Design a protein around this ligand. Structure first.
Ligand SMILES: C[C@]12CC[C@H]3[C@@H](CCC4=CC(=O)CC[C@@]43C)[C@@H]1CC[C@@H]2O
Ligand SMILES: C[C@]12CC[C@H]3[C@@H](CCC4=CC(=O)CC[C@@]43C)[C@@H]1CC[C@@H]2O
Lengths: 278, 278
């Protein structure tokens, strides 16, 4: 039978491209449940699916809001096969700005969607995998989950949290036959100045501008095509003994090694301040 | 004048012992605001304060619930000096058990207290430090924030999140004169089987027992006295150029280095499964 895949956050970006890559696979090996918070956003997904000639029935959309455990359970019940071979936890939110300028609701939302929503997915689908002794779980990671980035304090908190969540589960899941992997992505092709200025000091504001200018230059130079990133997920899926982490690029490994080599954090803080700010 | 210190989570453990260490310092250098979620739990703190003969006025208690930004702001207004020289973000919750056995509320609470509550403290007190160009922020960390531990999935998610939060802020704060440091603690001297069994499978349940037996043995062998741990906070406070991280012990550095040296995570997962389970 087909490998049943359920992917969260398929309205755009990595989840959209992964969903159509799998559904359009020439071997027709996969049945994909592409889940979205709001079905009103499914148009780009269906435009992409048609462009790759996904066979009828290879791709289905479900509404799934990872903030709501009832929505998670209702989507699980919509899997007609009664099993999920591959779960891809990809839904996520970004949050950029001076820490004191971020709304309390926005902070709590990033954590609820990125972290608690992944926990909700894992609590809903892991038990069936553990009892069957098979299943693959892929989690969309970021280089921001491996090293702290200025003005991404809460985003990095949430991506570092997925690292701890997944590494902790991987230690237990080792002998269960259930494989969990993080796909560590760099940049991928996919408030107003006035309000930020009102909630922070002028120096922090100026540094935010510098960060934004630097970020745009790196994105322009180094963002990867979503097709190349989606193929790393497929590589992890086909591995007989998948590792805990896959990297979409080796570009940030040097910064990572410097980080990991000086546990006091001094070398990394100095190097990243220089890298972003000059 | 005195160095004004505000510490969260002083009802027991590290925060209680730190508060009385600082308030009883022979030099009388510190004025300590020991904050607690519920003032009904302040008895051990006052028993400890009297035992160390903390001078009258060296220690004051404030009610502060880090889940509530109004409580954070009301406590900030109670600092009569109108400034905080040292902020110690220590309030935290643990959560242990099979992931699928944890209540959704309990998960969301660990994240709200440990992560969003620290963000609330930083948003409330950082701006004044940045404008003055001085201030120390100490955050209670854990070895569980540096490496994933089985059956601590959500606890480790939350402690890994503080790593990302603090490292991201430290990159920005470098030139502001505001110093942020994590104090990485190992074990420190400080649901029912039936309900866990009903929410998980028998194999996971057996592994939980093994984890608990192992954890108790390590705690018995390696837990540090809270006095020794509190003194690491003082060491970070007195450093002219404090590093991002301080370690209370070097016992877990080897596991950490192995972790950091194999970015795929394979060596760490295998080593920690063997370390916990045999
Ligand atoms: C900060 C940074 C440039 C901006 C990058 C960041 C990695 C992650 C990232 C993803 C994006 O989509 C926007 C650009 C950013 C935010 C990079 C890591 C090192 C580099 O200097
Ligand atoms: C899991 C472990 C034993 C139990 C330790 C853990 C570090 C943190 C910790 C703190 C505690 O208070 C309980 C014991 C635990 C949970 C250790 C890290 C490696 C060691 O094998």
């Amino acid at each position: 039978a087909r490998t049943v895949v359920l992917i969260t956050g398929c309205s755009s970006g990595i989840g959209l491209h992964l969903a159509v890559r799998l559904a359009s696979d020439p071997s027709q090996s996969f049945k994909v449940y592409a889940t979205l918070r709001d079905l009103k956003t499914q148009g780009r997904l269906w435009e992409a699916a048609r462009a790759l000639a996904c066979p009828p029935g290879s791709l289905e959309t479900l509404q799934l809001d990872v903030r709501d455990s009832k929505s998670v359970a209702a989507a699980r019940e919509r899997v007609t096969e009664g099993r999920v071979d591959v779960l891809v936890c990809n839904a996520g939110l970004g949050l950029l700005g001076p820490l004191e300028a971020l709304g309390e609701d926005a902070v709590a939302s990033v954590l609820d969607v990125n972290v608690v929503g992944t926990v909700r997915m894992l609590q809903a689908f892991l038990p069936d995998m553990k009892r069957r002794g098979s299943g693959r779980v892929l989690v969309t990671g970021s280089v921001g989950g491996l090293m702290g980035l200025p003005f991404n304090d809460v985003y990095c908190a949430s991506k570092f949290a997925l690292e701890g969540l997944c590494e902790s589960l991987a230690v237990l899941l080792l002998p269960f036959g259930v494989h969990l992997s993080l796909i560590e992505c760099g940049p991928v092709h996919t408030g107003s100045p006035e309000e930020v200025l009102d909630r922070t000091d002028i120096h922090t504001f100026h540094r935010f501008y510098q960060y934004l200018a630097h970020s745009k230059q790196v994105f322009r130079e180094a963002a990867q095509n979503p097709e190349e990133v989606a193929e790393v997920f497929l590589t992890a899926l086909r591995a007989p003994k998948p590792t805990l982490r896959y990297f979409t690029t080796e570009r940030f490994l040097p910064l990572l090694r410097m980080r990991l080599d000086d546990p006091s954090g001094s070398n990394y803080v100095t190097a990243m301040h220089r890298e972003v700010f000059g």
